[PDB]
Amino acid sequence: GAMNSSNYAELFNNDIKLFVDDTNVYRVTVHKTFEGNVATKAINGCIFTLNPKTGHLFLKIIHTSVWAGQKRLSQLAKWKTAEEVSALVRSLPKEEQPKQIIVTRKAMLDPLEVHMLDFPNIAIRPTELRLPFSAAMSIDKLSDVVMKATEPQMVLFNIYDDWLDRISSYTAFSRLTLLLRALKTNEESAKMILLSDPTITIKSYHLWPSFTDEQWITIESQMRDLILTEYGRKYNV
């Protein structure tokens, strides 16, 4: 059924699975028209498909051309997302296709179910978890590849960099969620935490800086403080 706190550790077992987050598929800037009306301008989007175990991120870039002359774009975006996931599955060898796909929004369930009717043995699931995958576009290198794309394009990343050499996937995912939660609650402060020390750099083949084990503990505490801080600023606590 649905993924929640009782069965959190199923993400890290050895059944291949993907999270699908569709929040940044359809992105617009709302602006005033000369006539004083309001109009949207779409910008490039991306499907965030992630293996939580391996960290393999299949970042499908949604160029604004895919919306031209289309109506009801928020609805199309769910079905566009479903089309591209079903394409990715179909592109993978069978031993690499997911046994389950977990959607971060219930509105993706039916689109994705209907596009995966050829794959009856792949479970399509919602989750009760509030995951911060919408902040994926706060990761500079991902945001860069999206905004520079001139055409539809898939780029493959590892969102855990080399972390799994040293920590487990449960722990890697927990770090990632905390990073993204912080970038979602206060992007500027989160980026300041991450990049304040020039001597820790991001390797060309990585998304995040090359923090030592001890420095990640610092960072992770500073990230929790940030999320705590903003919680108080928000609610006046």
Partner: protein, 300 residues
Amino acid sequence: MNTVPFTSAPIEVTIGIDQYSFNVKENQPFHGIKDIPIGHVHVIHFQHADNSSMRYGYWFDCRMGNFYIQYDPKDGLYKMMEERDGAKFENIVHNFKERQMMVSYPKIDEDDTWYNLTEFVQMDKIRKIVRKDENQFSYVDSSMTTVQENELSDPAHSLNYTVINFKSREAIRPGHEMEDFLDKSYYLNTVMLQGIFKNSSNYFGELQFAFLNAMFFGNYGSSLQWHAMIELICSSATVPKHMLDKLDEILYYQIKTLPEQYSDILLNERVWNICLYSSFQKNSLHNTEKIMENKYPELL
């Protein structure tokens, strides 16, 4: 007019004939039902007094044979029989009619209710949904599951309705995933109508039969089949004008005939609200929306 004579009524039973019904007391001198309109299918149905579990009944057409009902003390129910000896049927029927031991099918001359509920129902099709070819009548009860139900146990006793499943490869064209899910006209017109039913009459007949099995037997799978066949039309953007007009008529009479007090169990709130207010055909079922709103507004 035709006659279904009864050998006797040994156990107290509420007897149903189409939309009428009357109580027969245990061993009451009841010898059957007379003046049944030739030209329609009919349904004679039972609910035992001592155990209202299992409503059960027989669909029949008086044109297809001489039928009578004898209680079976071993199987414990009123069983429909066919008497092939025509002469014997006339003598059996003529004594009971002279001794006035029979209830008259009580049709009012202003009343087209049954014609309207069975307009498109044919025995030949009933008998493909209810497989039991050694009889010209068809047995149905409350508990019989449908073929799709069995997909989600005894296949001989199922209701072989036409499977409708909106999240099925049959229903969804490759490359038209969204278009075909949000607008079911493909599934309705090409798949169901042209492909499976051949015409809208055959479609409406199954729908009308599903409603009747739901209403008369509380057969849950029939009610599912009824709602699916409605929802399939209402969720199609492109429906022939004559089909929508007839559908409105079909549904109006079904809602009109429904017991007010059974509405909570035989009427799917989601399907109806969707159909009348959210679907492509929200504005096209004028008679049905009017009766539904004036009779069951609570549901809406």
